[PDB]
Design an enzyme around this catalytic site. Structure first.
Site: not given
Ligand code: HEM
Ligand code: HEM
Ligand SMILES: O=C1O[C@H]([C@@H](O)CO)C(O)=C1O
Ligand SMILES: O=C1O[C@H]([C@@H](O)CO)C(O)=C1O
Ligand SMILES: [K+]
Ligand SMILES: [K+]
Lengths: 248, 248
Positions: B162, B37, B41, B207, B178
């Site tokens: 995710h 993440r 970012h 999603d 997820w």
């Molecule tokens: C497609 C649009 C996306 C949206 C709207 C989005 C949004 C989010 C949100 C709201 C979270 C939760 C953050 C939290 O509360 O801890 C999250 C977690 C995460 N995102 Fe996304 N994301 C997107 C795309 C991506 C992409 C492109 C990647 C990497 C290739 C990614 C990887 C992750 C990972 C691995 C987590 C889990 C982080 C953790 O467990 O601490 N996401 N995302």
């Protein structure tokens, strides 16, 4: 280094008619400083490295008016909306910069050359590019120089725009006029800046920064001694500011 | 269309040694999702029109960590600071992207090719470029497509990131994993997305947008049926994301 776009004869006629209507409206409403400040805050978001921002009509967007540096400029946008609607052919970008040029003229200042043809663009620039009144020369050079691409001479000359108008504690938090004649465009900003604080008159830290810098200070002395020289450099700088990112 | 910069042999040795240390550290700390993440970012702020933003180490700045979309990523930066200090020759930009590549590898995912040579840049990009979880396909295309310059296939594949991790109500406000195996990199994100809401598992509006779009939905079906095909497209997309604005 400018190459101005071609506009139709009807567009040119509309510029000339709006210029006159702006003179009458701005003079009657006593809002020339606000209108100058609107045009400057429109143009002053330009970043030359990315070619983003600048005088392309985005300041009328609620998103850009909300920026804290633009507190109060929603009054200006609203004041001009009835007149703009009489000139539908004109871009907002051209209209706001024409208003800034007229603001200077109708308060007695130099006649800043105006060229039409700015196109209204759909995205406001990021917040935070306009200068911070509590900061000094380095910050001025970062903003006007590194972002906008103006010279140290432009910085000083354009700061004399404060020769008209006042701060408002409900907008920036600063309060009061820089000069004893805030609807008269003259070199008084520089003569007050040099004389020290007088009661009732305003000096921002960003104004005072001009006195302590070895490049800015001679300009301040020049403009306070020679209003014709201030007018010349002001007109140069305003024209450049109003055309940032336009017709390059 | 990439032309990768030359780095010294000592730099290359440091990449290889940091890669191993990152594997051990990320596996032991159970923070691969957070690290993925962090890398995403970092890179996902790229704007191709201005060439601003992207994976150039700026996310460790407090100004960029404060962005609400980066809530929680200060934990990641702090977790990695002791290891980074053992590899002073490496840029932060290379180090964070290497951590993202390792995060995927150590949870069982594809081996994303890595090329060194990103330089740390001094200005964070403007806030607001990362995607909004409450929005849909148009917004996804605006962000990944119009700003970053990735394809619709990349969008879907990268969303399967995710498949590891969880939301946290104290960070985004969403809560939960997820998938039933949030430290295992597999196609489970897509099989859950297709099966409907199951209790205990998370689906963001962003999603769900993948299921209703005529281009995204076939990809979702492809990845849920063919994990090898997900891994291939994921590795392609991650490599592109990690190299946005780099070595062009
Ligand atoms: C497609 C649009 C996306 C949206 C709207 C989005 C949004 C989010 C949100 C709201 C979270 C939760 C953050 C939290 O509360 O801890 C999250 C977690 C995460 N995102 Fe996304 N994301 C997107 C795309 C991506 C992409 C492109 C990647 C990497 C290739 C990614 C990887 C992750 C990972 C691995 C987590 C889990 C982080 C953790 O467990 O601490 N996401 N995302
Ligand atoms: C040099 C850096 C500058 C700083 C730090 C600065 C800051 C400010 C501030 C804080 C105010 C008061 C706003 C309010 O409370 O109503 C103001 C007013 C004003 N500014 Fe500047 N400004 C700068 C440059 C400029 C330039 C370049 C121009 C135009 C060429 C300009 C034109 C004006 C005018 C005309 C007013 C009075 C507005 C009114 O009476 O409503 N300023 N400025
Ligand atoms: O320049 C200005 O015009 C109005 C007012 O002074 C006269 O209408 C105001 O709010 C400004 O700051
Ligand atoms: O992926 C993550 O790692 C930590 C924790 O889950 C294990 O250390 C956390 O805060 C993340 O979101
Ligand atoms: K005056
Ligand atoms: K999983």
């Amino acid at each position: 280094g400018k190459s101005y776009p071609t506009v139709s004869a009807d567009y040119q006629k509309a510029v000339e008619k709006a210029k006159k209507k702006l003179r009458g409206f701005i003079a009657e409403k006593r809002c020339a400083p606000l209108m100058l400040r609107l045009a400057w805050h429109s143009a002053g978001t330009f970043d030359k490295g990315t070619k983003t921002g600048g005088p392309f009509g985005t300041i009328k967007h609620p998103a850009e008016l909300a920026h804290s540096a633009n507190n109060g400029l929603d009054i200006a946008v609203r004041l001009l909306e009835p007149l703009k609607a009489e000139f539908p052919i004109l871009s907002y970008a051209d209209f706001y910069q024409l208003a800034g040029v007229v603001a200077v003229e109708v308060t007695g200042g130099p006649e800043v050359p105006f060229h039409p043809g700015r196109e209204d663009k759909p995205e406001p620039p990021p917040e935070g590019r306009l200068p911070d009144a509590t900061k000094g020369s380095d910050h001025l050079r970062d903003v006007f120089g590194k972002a906008m691409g103006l010279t140290d001479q432009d910085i000083v000359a354009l700061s004399g725009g404060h020769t008209i108008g006042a701060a408002h504690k409900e907008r920036s938090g600063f309060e009061g006029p820089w000069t004893s004649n805030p609807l008269i465009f003259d070199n008084s900003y520089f003569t007050e800046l040099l004389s020290g604080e007088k009661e009732g008159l305003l000096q921002l830290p960003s104004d005072k920064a001009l006195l302590s810098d070895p490049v800015f200070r001679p300009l301040v002395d020049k403009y306070a001694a020679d209003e014709d020289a201030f007018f010349a450099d002001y007109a140069e700088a305003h024209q450049k500011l109003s055309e940032l990112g336009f017709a390059d």
